[PDB]
Amino acid sequence: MPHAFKPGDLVFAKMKGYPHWPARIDDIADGAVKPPPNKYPIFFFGTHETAFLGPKDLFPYDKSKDKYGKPNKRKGFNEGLWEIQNNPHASYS
């Protein structure tokens, strides 16, 4: 059975106006800005941007990849597909 989201989990993350996007739940570094309550720090592959999202916008990657893991014209997206498949736990900073 599912657990709650934890750092390192792989997802497609949904933002309004953008396609479901390859991403991971990030850790929060010592001394770094924390997310609001009930929100997670989402690192988007390809763009390497961070937004704070709740579970309603997080789709576990294994379950969702057949639907959402197809190339997309949007900037950064196809790089993001490579990262999530090939090195999802690397440092991209």
From Swiss-Prot:
What are the transmembrane regions? none
What region holds the PWWP domain?
A: 7-64
Q: In which tissues is it expressed?
A: Widely expressed. High expression is found in heart, skeletal muscle, ovary and testis. Overexpression is frequently observed in hepatocellular carcinoma samples.
Localization of this protein: Nucleus; Cytoplasm
| Role played | Acts as an epigenetic regulator of myogenesis in cooperation with DPF3a (isoform 2 of DPF3/BAF45C). Associates with the BAF complex via its interaction with DPF3a and HDGFL2-DPF3a activate myogenic genes by increasing chromatin accessibility through recruitment of SMARCA4/BRG1/BAF190A (ATPase subunit of the BAF complex) to myogenic gene promoters. Promotes the repair of DNA double-strand breaks (DSBs) through the homologous recombination pathway by facilitating the recruitment of the DNA endonuclease RBBP8 to the DSBs.
Assembly information from the UniProt record:
Interacts with HDGF. Interacts with trimethylated 'Lys-36' of histone H3 (H3K36me3). Interacts with trimethylated 'Lys-79' of histone H3 (H3K79me3), but has higher affinity for H3K36me3. Interacts with IWS1. Interacts with H2AX, POGZ, RBBP8 and CBX1. Interacts with histones H3K9me3, H3K27me3 and H3K36me2. Interacts with DPF3a (isoform 2 of DPF3/BAF45C). Interacts with SMARCA4/BRG1/BAF190A, SMARCC1/BAF155 and SMARCD1/BAF60A in a DPF3a-dependent manner.
Protein family membership: Belongs to the HDGF family.
Which protein, by its recorded name, is this? Hepatoma-derived growth factor-related protein 2
The organism's taxonomic lineage, starting at the top: Eukaryota, Metazoa, Chordata, Craniata, Vertebrata
